[PDB]
Amino acid sequence: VSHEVADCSHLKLTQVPDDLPTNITVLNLTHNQLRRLPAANFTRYSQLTSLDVGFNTISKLEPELCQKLPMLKVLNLQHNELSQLSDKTFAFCTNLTELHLMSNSIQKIKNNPFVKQKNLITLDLSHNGLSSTKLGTQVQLENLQELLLSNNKIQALKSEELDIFANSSLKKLELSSNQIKEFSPGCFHAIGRLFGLFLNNVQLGPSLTEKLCLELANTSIRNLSLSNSQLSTTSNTTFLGLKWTNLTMLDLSYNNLNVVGNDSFAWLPQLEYFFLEYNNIQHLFSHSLHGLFNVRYLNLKRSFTKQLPKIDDFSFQWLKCLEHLNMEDNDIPGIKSNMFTGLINLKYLSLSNSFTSLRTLTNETFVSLAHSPLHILNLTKNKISKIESDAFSWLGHLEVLDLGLNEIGQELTGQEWRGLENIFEIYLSYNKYLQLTRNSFALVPSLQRLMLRRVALKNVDSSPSPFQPLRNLTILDLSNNNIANINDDMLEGLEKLEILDLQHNNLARLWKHANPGGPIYFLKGLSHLHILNLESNGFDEIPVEVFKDLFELKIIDLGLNNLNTLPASVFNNQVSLKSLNLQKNLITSVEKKVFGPAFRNLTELDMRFNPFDCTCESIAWFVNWINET
Numbered sequence: 001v002s003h004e005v006a007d008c009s010h011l012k013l014t015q016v017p018d019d020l021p022t023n024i025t026v027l028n029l030t031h032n033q034l035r036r037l038p039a040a041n042f043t044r045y046s047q048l049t050s051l052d053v054g055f056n057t058i059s060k061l062e063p064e065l066c067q068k069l070p071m072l073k074v075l076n077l078q079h080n081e082l083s084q085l086s087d088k089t090f091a092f093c094t095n096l097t098e099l100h101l102m103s104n105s106i107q108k109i110k111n112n113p114f115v116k117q118k119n120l121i122t123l124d125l126s127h128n129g130l131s132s133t134k135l136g137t138q139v140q141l142e143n144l145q146e147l148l149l150s151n152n153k154i155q156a157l158k159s160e161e162l163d164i165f166a167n168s169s170l171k172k173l174e175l176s177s178n179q180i181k182e183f184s185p186g187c188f189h190a191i192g193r194l195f196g197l198f199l200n201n202v203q204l205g206p207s208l209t210e211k212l213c214l215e216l217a218n219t220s221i222r223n224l225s226l227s228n229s230q231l232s233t234t235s236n237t238t239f240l241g242l243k244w245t246n247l248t249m250l251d252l253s254y255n256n257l258n259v260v261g262n263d264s265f266a267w268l269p270q271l272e273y274f275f276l277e278y279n280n281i282q283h284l285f286s287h288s289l290h291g292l293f294n295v296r297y298l299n300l301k302r303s304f305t306k307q308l309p310k311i312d313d314f315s316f317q318w319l320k321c322l323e324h325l326n327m328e329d330n331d332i333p334g335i336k337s338n339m340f341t342g343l344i345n346l347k348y349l350s351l352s353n354s355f356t357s358l359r360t361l362t363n364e365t366f367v368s369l370a371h372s373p374l375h376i377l378n379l380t381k382n383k384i385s386k387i388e389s390d391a392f393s394w395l396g397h398l399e400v401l402d403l404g405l406n407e408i409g410q411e412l413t414g415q416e417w418r419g420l421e422n423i424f425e426i427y428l429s430y431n432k433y434l435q436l437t438r439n440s441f442a443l444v445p446s447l448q449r450l451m452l453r454r455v456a457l458k459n460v461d462s463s464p465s466p467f468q469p470l471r472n473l474t475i476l477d478l479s480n481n482n483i484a485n486i487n488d489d490m491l492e493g494l495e496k497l498e499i500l501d502l503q504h505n506n507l508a509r510l511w512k513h514a515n516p517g518g519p520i521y522f523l524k525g526l527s528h529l530h531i532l533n534l535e536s537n538g539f540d541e542i543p544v545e546v547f548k549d550l551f552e553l554k555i556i557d558l559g560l561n562n563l564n565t566l567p568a569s570v571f572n573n574q575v576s577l578k579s580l581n582l583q584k585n586l587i588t589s590v591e592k593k594v595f596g597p598a599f600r601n602l603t604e605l606d607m608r609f610n611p612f613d614c615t616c617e618s619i620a621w622f623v624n625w626i627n628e629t
C-alpha cells in the first residue's frame with residue numbers, strides 16, 4: 001500500500017484517500033468507484049508525478065486539479081465516463097508527458113483541449129467513437145511522439161485534420177481498427193515527421209494500399225504495419241509509392257495474402273525487417289521477393305497455404321543480407337536443390353514443422369545452403385525418419401542442429417555428421433530409436449552438447465564408448481531411454497562434462513554390490529560435473545565410491561528411487577554440493593556419518609516424501625516441506 005508509490009487499486013473507493021503521506025509521487029486509484037476528482041482532495045498530494053484513475057466512473061475534470069499537481073507527468077483516465085472535453089479540462093496540466101484517455105466514449109473533439117500540452121509525448125485516445133483525427137485547430141503538441149487513435153470510427157484521413165502536427169515528429173501514429181476508406185492527398189505530409197504508421201485491422205486491400213503508399217511517398221516513414229488489412233494479393237504497383245521512402249520494417253501478417261506478384265517489393269531496397277507470417281500464399285514466384293536485398297529478418301511462419309504450397313527454386317536468391325529466416329509451421333513439399341541459393345548471409349534458419357514431411361535427409365537435401373554462413377538450423381517436427389550419410393556436409397559453419405521431435409529410427413553410423421566442423425550442439429531428443437556405434441559421433445569432436453532424451457537409445461555400452469571422441473562435451477542428456485547397460489568407461493576422458501542426465505533409465509543393478517564383476521563406477525573422473533540427474537532408476541544401493549571424483553558437483557537428483565541405507569562417507573568428496581534431492585525414496589534415517597558432509601554447504605534440500613524414523617533436526621537454509629516433513 002506504500003513505498004512512496006500509493007496502491008489504492010481495487011478497494012471500492014467512492015472518494016480519494018485523505019490520509020496518505022504527503023510524500024507520495026504516484027497515486028494509483030485504478031478500479032474503484034470514483035465519480036469525480038475534486039481539486040481540494042489533492043492539495044495534500046502536491047508531489048504527484050503520476051495519477052492513475054483508470055477504471056472508475058469519472059465524468060469530469062476540475063481544471064484546478066492540475067494547479068494542485070504542478071508536477072503531474074502521467075495522467076491515466078482510461079475507462080471512465082469522460083466523453084466531453086473542453087479547453088479548460090487540461091489547460092493547467094502543462095507538465096504532462098503522458099495522457100491516457102482510452103475507453104471514455106469520446107465521440108467528438110471540438111476545439112483545442114490539448115493546446116497547453118506542450119511537453120506531451122504520448123496521447124492515447126484509443127477505443128472511443130472519434131470519426132476524425134482532428135484534435136485541435138492550430139499547430140500544437142510539438143513534442144508529441146505517440147498518437148494512438150486505434151479502435152475509433154475514423155473513416156478518412158485529411159491534411160487539414162493532421163496539420164496541427166506540422167511541428168511534431170511522430171514515432172507512432174496508431175490508426176488500427178478504424179474503417180479508413182480515404183487517404184486524402186497530402187494527409188501524411190501534414191505531420192512534421194512521421195516515422196511509424198499502424199493500420200492493423202483496417203480493411204484496405206491492394207487498391208487502397210497503393211493509394212496509401214503514394215501518400216507516404218517522401219515522408220520519414222520507417223515502420224509500416226498493415227496486419228489483417230485484407231491484402232489478399234500484391235502486385236508490382238501496390239508498394240510503388242514506398243520507392244520514395246527509406247522504409248525499414250513492413251508488416252503484412254494475417255492478410256490471407258494469396259498471390260505475391262513479381263516485383264511486389266522491388267521498391268523497398270532499404271527494408272530490413274519483414275513480417276509475412278500467417279498468410280495463404282499458394283505459390284511463391286521466383287521474382288516475388290526481387291529487390292529485398294537489405295532484408296535481415298524475414299518471418300514466413302504459416303505464410304503459405306495449408307493442406308500444397310509451391311516455392312519456385314531461387315525465390316530467396318535476392319535476399320543477400322538475410323540473416324534470420326523463420327519458415328516454421330508450413331506444408332512445403334520438401335527442399336529443392338536451389339531453395340536457399342543466394343542466401344549468403346543467412347545465419348539462422350528455422351524449418352520447424354515447415355514441410356508436409358522431409359522423410360529422408362539425403363546428401364542433397366541441404367545443398368542450396370552450401371554458401372550460407374549458417375549457424376543455427378531447426379529441423380524439429382518434420383516427421384523425419386532417416387538421416388543418410390553426408391546430409392549436413394554443406395553446413396561446415398553450423399553450430400546448432402535441432403533434430404528433436406522427429407521420428408528418426410536408425411543406427412547412427414557417424415557419417416550423418418560429416419562436414420560439421422563447427423558443431424556445438426546436436427539435439428536429437430524425442431525420436432523413435434537411435435542405435436549408437438563407437439563411431440556415431442567421431443566426426444564431430446567439437447561437440448559440446450548432445451541431447452538424446454527419449455530416443456530408445458541402444459548400445460551406449462559400445463566398447464570404446466560412443467562418447468569417447470567428445471572430449472569437449474559439457475552437456476549429455478541420456479534420460480528416458482530405459483538404459484540398463486553402461487560400462488565404467490562410458491564417460492572416460494570427458495573431464496569437461498558439466499551436466500549429465502540419466503533419469504528414467506534402468507541402472508539399479510549396476511550399483512548393487514551383487515552386480516557380477518562388481519558395481520559400475522561410471523562417474524569416475526568427472527571432475528567438472530555440476531549437475532547430475534539420477535532420478536527414477538530403481539536404485540536401492542549406492543556403492544560408497546561412486547561420487548568420489550565429483551568435487552565440483554553442485555546439484556544431485558537421486559529422487560524417485562528406492563534408497564534407504566546409504567553407506568557412511570558416500571558424500572564425503574561432495575565439497576561443492578548446493579542441492580541434494582532425495583525425494584520419494586525409502587529413507588527411514590538421516591545419520592551424520594552419511595549426511596554431515598552433504599548438508600555442510602547446502603542451500604536446498606528435498607527429502608520431502610520419505611518414510612522417516614530415526615532423525616536429526618534442521619537449521620540454516622531452504623527445506624521446502626512443513627507438510628511433507
Ligand SMILES: *[C@@H]1O[C@H](CO)[C@@H](O[C@@H]2O[C@H](CO)[C@@H](O)[C@H](O)[C@H]2NC(C)=O)[C@H](O)[C@H]1NC(C)=O
Binds near residue numbers: 217218219220244246
Ligand atoms: C532516405 O535517406 C536518405 C539518406 O539518408 C535521405 O537523404 C537525406 O537528404 C539530405 C538533404 O536532401 C542529404 O543531405 C542527405 O543525403 C540525407 N540526410 C540525412 C538525413 O542523413 C532521404 O531524404 C531519405 N528519404 C526520405 C523520404 O526521407
Ligand SMILES: *[C@@H]1O[C@H](CO)[C@@H](O[C@@H]2O[C@H](CO)[C@@H](O)[C@H](O)[C@H]2NC(C)=O)[C@H](O)[C@H]1NC(C)=O
Binds near residue numbers: 171172196223
Ligand atoms: C520498427 O520496427 C522494428 C523491427 O520490428 C522495431 O524494433 C524492434 O522492436 C522489438 C520490440 O519492440 C525488438 O524485439 C527488436 O530488437 C527491435 N529491433 C531492432 C533491431 O531495433 C521498432 O520498435 C519499430 N519502431 C516503432 C517505433 O514501432
Ligand SMILES: *[C@@H]1O[C@H](CO)[C@@H](O[C@@H]2O[C@H](CO)[C@@H](O)[C@H](O)[C@H]2NC(C)=O)[C@H](O)[C@H]1NC(C)=O
Binds near residue numbers: 353
Ligand atoms: C526449434 O524450434 C522449436 C519451435 O518449433 C523450439 O521449441 C520451442 O522452444 C521452447 C524452449 O525450448 C519451448 O518451451 C517451446 O514450447 C517450443 N515451442 C514449440 C512451438 O514447440 C526449439 O527451441 C527450437 N530449437 C532451438 C535450438 O532453438
Ligand SMILES: *[C@@H]1O[C@H](CO)[C@@H](O[C@@H]2O[C@H](CO)[C@@H](O)[C@H](O)[C@H]2NC(C)=O)[C@H](O)[C@H]1NC(C)=O
Binds near residue numbers: 446
Ligand atoms: C576443445 O576445446 C578447446 C577450447 O578450450 C579447443 O582448443 C582451443 O582451440 C582454439 C580455437 O581453435 C584455440 O584458440 C586454442 O589454441 C585452443 N585452446 C587450448 C587450451 O588448447 C579445441 O579445439 C576443442 N576441440 C575441438 C575438436 O574443437
Ligand SMILES: *[C@@H]1O[C@H](CO)[C@@H](O)[C@H](O)[C@H]1NC(C)=O
Binds near residue numbers: 236237
Ligand atoms: C508490373 O507489371 C507488368 C508486368 O505484367 C508490367 O507491364 C509493368 O510495367 C510492371 N511494372 C510496373 C512498375 O508497373
Ligand SMILES: *[C@@H]1O[C@H](CO)[C@@H](O)[C@H](O)[C@H]1NC(C)=O
Binds near residue numbers: 363364
Ligand atoms: C549422394 O549419395 C549417393 C549414394 O547413394 C550418390 O549416388 C551420390 O553420388 C551422392 N551425391 C554427392 C553430392 O556426393
Ligand SMILES: *[C@H]1O[C@H](CO)[C@@H](O)[C@H](O)[C@H]1NC(C)=O
Binds near residue numbers: 070071095
Ligand atoms: C514540470 O515543470 C515545472 C517547472 O516549471 C515543475 O512544476 C515540475 O517540477 C516539472 N515536472 C516534474 C519534475 O514532475
Ligand SMILES: *[C@H]1O[C@H](CO)[C@@H](O)[C@H](O)[C@H]1NC(C)=O
Binds near residue numbers: 286288
Ligand atoms: C514472375 O512470375 C511469373 C508469374 O506471374 C512467371 O511467369 C515469371 O517467370 C516470373 N518472372 C521472371 C522474369 O522469371
